[PDB]
Amino acid sequence: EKKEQKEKEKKEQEIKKKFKLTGPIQVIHLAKACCDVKGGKNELSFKQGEQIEIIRITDNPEGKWLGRTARGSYGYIKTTAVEIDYDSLKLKKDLE
Q1: Nearest-angstrom CA–CA distance, 47 and 90
Q2: Cβ contacts of 68 within 8 Å, gap of 6 or more
């Protein structure tokens, strides 16, 4: 099997208090890294087109969004550094 996991990684204690999540949810949308940043001023480290996931947009305290990287890193993106995929997959699903 793929036994490459020890935790789901909730060791991200700094992110929790930084953005204030309380109850973690699932990805809302997959954002595309609009640029390559290395996580300055407490941000997420990502490369242009890396693909990020947006989790918390609501009740953001600093104006920035909470984005996660595939490895589980929540860097609370400055919104300008990403572009979220609008819709979902099929937000409109008329059974098509």
Answers
A1: 27
A2: 27, 44, 52, 53, 55, 74, 75
Domain count within the chain: 1
Instruction: Answer yes or no: is 47 within a domain.
Output: yes
Q: Would 93 be classed as within a structural domain?
A: no
- Residue 26's domain comprises 12-85
Query: Which amino acid type is present at position 42?
Result: N
SS3 85: coil
Amino acid identity, residue 48? Q
Q: What is the CATH classification number for the domain harbouring 50?
A: 2.30.30.40
CB-neighbour burial class of residue 45 (10 A; exposed 0-12, middle 13-18, buried 19+):
middle
Q: Would you say residue 57 lies in a domain? A: yes
Q: State the structure-solving technique.
A: NMR
